[PDB]
């Protein structure tokens, strides 16, 4: 089985910790430290390309963030290891980080994390509801589950201009997105540049399901969406960021009008053993 | 024709703005109030791979910031403008970046900004020299200056854990960098992740001279060196850095035992006409 | 008559924001737009002292943050309006913070705010638990709410530091605070300088009652305690503060080894009539 | 016998820290890492008036910043220690800052640090000459040194609204200053309410002069003057401080119309001796 990566009753706050491998000599200690700690429910583990290919193993279906030349910024921004703790009580997750940090300082420093939380039951600091569309029960293991109970998941950053978006007309504001605010409507006749239709998971080739574990987040950086992707490979988060950035046809995704990705990561998800987490094909 | 990139009475301040494209409709009246102010000398322009693909304009040699599957972090960060601020007064460059900034208001966003300075009078802040190997005028022109006098440079902010490495022995510094600190020549009996010894112009299929305009940084982030490598083209950066990454012998760059890169960006620096600069190739 | 200050199902989130009165003229404008938001449950108003006299005004029992000339630092930032915000979502009182800073735009300008949450369900990040001994039900009314509904509230934002305290032993622990962290019960064999043994509201003469509202906090300025006390006047705060700077006997509180206040300032919470937020002593 | 504070070529770039006394019992230690590296021109420094309190020694003349209860927020944040760096190499202050606070560690932390640099030759950063009627030679020793050796200093960090003061016709930004920016000339027309007008040094019942040792500042909190006042008492500054905030007519400085102080406090810098710095009231 996979770790809790679908839970349907989704904790109020998130933390995501990224790091960078600095000392390999120093990673068995902290390994040994920190696998007995990953539970999958409120601790959950992804192992980036780097640390793969420090130890000389290569994970099937793991690869870098991509670099998409286009004539928007997808930023490029791979760390070794991603923690992702899930919880209810916002202080509680702030102690572990700093237990975390120091249980794998030796080897790995933190380079970047993210204090995320779930506005209102599951919508995006502009207002309109996210996670619809997301598949449900099976159909979530179809899109994010391999066969082997691995997952492959896509992290960006996006910062939010609140203050811009929520100063034009709803009519405008609606056509960014795709969908109306007041119902949560897809607008049908919007433009091609609209976010709903860039992304209409039935209009690629395969079905490019995905399921979306984003979170909304605010700090010194700013404001806007952690944005989560689960998929079976990264194929699926792939195929539609392309089509986002108007490498598919040329027109570029309303999105990036308003808001832009600081950050970017593709990450393996290990299964869950008996033993805990399933880190054979690495070590 | 080339702009003062290498002027050696270099001042004491610069500050590197970097730009997001939003609004591409009102591009045109954001660059007749920028390309006045570029003389070359004290403002310095470098235009970046989604700034050409946005004008449907291909630019021989520019392409953006590469994607290296290391075992070390280099992030792309590639953006879409690129200014160089050079100057003696810290604070005339701080009110030149809101005049700027304002100036480019609704198309161009400033995505990132660095305060830099030059340390002592060319050194890094852990005290070593900098630009020791670097070619000198006229053995320059031909090295960092492209045929048609527009030059390619790689931008990348390094962050320094100067605490770590300055905790370390004497003998451990020398051999992580290549030199000794206290007369900087070079150590032949470095290990071969010596810095000096990854770098060395020389030892590359062609003889891979670039021209280094590094300037230290200091901020909240931390501090570290805003590396800046000028090139007729980018083969120059792009094969040392490969090489640093381990991605030719096996063998990473002692660097990233201590720094780590932030940013990445590729950047053209078109040519100095009599108007002034000359943006000819993107109309 | 008064504010909703006493409710004890706290929610889980908090916002405290600061103004500092900047245009007088446009404060009327400023007023007739906030004050129907304040119902005393979800946004909670306190004045402060350089708002009464910004009209001329004389409140009986408002002064500014004192100034204690101690052998430990208790700053005074003492600002013109207090806005408490409280929430279960925290992304709702986040968007409040932006509509709250534009309708008092011109006259008001935001000099600080803090993000806080209830730890658990009201315990200290330290891990003891906070408002053990506060007054009960109708003794809060008698202790913390004046002669007209009103109260008197100090607020500070100490910073914890988290990382050494919890190097120390527990006993060390549980003799800066004054009660043992396992089962929550007081040390009556601790040192004078232990944290419960200076502030005994039984210990005073006269009875130095107060009600202690207190949410934690963490951000770029680290993590700690958002210290709110309220009484039905500023005395039973300002003696116990003394008592634990030293002051009144010379013992210095053992709270002072691990954590330090970074703002102060005295509030006057108005009371709450049938029409709204009564402001008639300041018009 | 006194500090450099009166050099009259002042270094391009200064450093402010303050730091809290949080264990006096290692605060002998630290003073004998710190005492022979101040020798009053590079490195000076001040004491708080805390740290007279922790020793149970008094100096005649020193206390804390005191607290006025006007309309506009003056803040007291007095601390312990004071150090002021100075120095042409912006990348030698920094380093001097991770070093002592290495030394001083146990004893005291720093609780502020302050990026300061001095514009054009003396400026502030709205383009105004700062420093124009500052005493200069013989006259400074007599305002700005006691008897002895030691001289009295008030620090204010203010925080600039550069954005909104340069949208002011310009005859509106004279009468808030009460020069003309074009020549520097004073506008006897000004209004009362002129800073000039404010802090005319000979309209007090003594001629209140004070030595003026400010820089501009700039980082994450904005950008400001930091305000340094060196007088022989604390008594020039402070009869200044109290006709700008109104509490001797009732008029108001036009400086509070865009800038404001961040922080405040009074620090005594002690006498320098051919051995060191002198602080024999202090042992
Ligand atoms: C600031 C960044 C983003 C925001 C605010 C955002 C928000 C939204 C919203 C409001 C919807 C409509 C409601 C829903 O169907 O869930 C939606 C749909 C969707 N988004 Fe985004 N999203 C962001 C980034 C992305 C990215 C980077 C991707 C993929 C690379 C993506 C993929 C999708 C998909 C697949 C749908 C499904 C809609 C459908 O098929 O009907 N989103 N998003
Ligand atoms: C933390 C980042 C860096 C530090 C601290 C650093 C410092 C140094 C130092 C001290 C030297 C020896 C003296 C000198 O040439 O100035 C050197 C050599 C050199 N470095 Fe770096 N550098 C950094 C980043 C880079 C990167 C990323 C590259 C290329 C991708 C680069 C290119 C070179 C070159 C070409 C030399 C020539 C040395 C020779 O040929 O003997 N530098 N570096
Ligand atoms: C970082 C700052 C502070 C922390 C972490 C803290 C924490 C605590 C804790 C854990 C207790 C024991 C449990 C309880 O009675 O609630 C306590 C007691 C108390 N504290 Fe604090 N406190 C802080 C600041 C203050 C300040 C500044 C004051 C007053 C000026 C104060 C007033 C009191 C009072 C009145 C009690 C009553 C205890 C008794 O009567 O037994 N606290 N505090
Ligand atoms: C943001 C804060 C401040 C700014 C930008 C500022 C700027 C100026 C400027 C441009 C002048 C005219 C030329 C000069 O004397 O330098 C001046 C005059 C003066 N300033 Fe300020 N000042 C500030 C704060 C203060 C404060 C708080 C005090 C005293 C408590 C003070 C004391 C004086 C005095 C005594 C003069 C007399 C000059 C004369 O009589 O010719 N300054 N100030």
């Excluded at 959950?44 to 991509?66: D, M, T």
């Excluded at 944005?227 to 990264?234: D, E, H, P, T, Y």
Aim: glycine letters at 8%; aromatic letters at 8%.
């Amino acid at each position: 089985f996979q770790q809790g990566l679908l839970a349907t009753p989704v904790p109020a706050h998130a933390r995501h910790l990224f790091f960078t491998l600095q000392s390999p000599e120093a990673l068995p200690a902290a390994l040994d430290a920190l696998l007995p700690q990953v539970d999958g429910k409120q601790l959950l583990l992804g192992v980036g390309a780097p640390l793969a290919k420090a130890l000389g193993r290569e994970i099937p279906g793991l690869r870098p963030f991509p670099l998409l030349d286009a004539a928007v910024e997808n930023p490029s921004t791979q760390h070794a290891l991603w923690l992702w703790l899930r919880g209810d009580e916002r202080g509680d997750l702030l102690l572990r980080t700093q237990a975390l940090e120091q249980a794998l300082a030796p080897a790995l420093s933190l380079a970047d994390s993210v204090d995320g939380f779930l506005h209102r039951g599951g919508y995006d600091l502009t207002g309109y509801e996210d996670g619809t569309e997301n598949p449900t029960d099976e159909e979530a293991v179809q899109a994010a589950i391999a066969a082997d109970g691995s997952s492959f998941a896509a992290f960006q950053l996006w910062k939010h201009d609140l203050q811009y978006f929520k100063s034009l007309p709803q009519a405008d504001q609606d056509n960014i997105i795709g969908r109306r605010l007041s119902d949560n409507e897809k607008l049908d006749d919007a433009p091609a540049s609209a976010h709903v239709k860039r992304t209409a998971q039935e209009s690629f080739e395969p079905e490019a399901f995905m399921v979306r574990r984003s979170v909304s987040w605010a700090d010194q950086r700013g404001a806007g969406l952690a944005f989560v992707a689960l998929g079976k490979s990264f194929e699926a988060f792939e195929v539609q960021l392309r089509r986002m950035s108007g490498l598919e046809d040329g027109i570029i995704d309303g999105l990036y009008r308003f808001s832009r990705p600081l950050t970017g990561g593709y990450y393996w998800c290990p299964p869950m053993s008996e033993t805990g987490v399933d880190l054979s094909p690495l070590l």
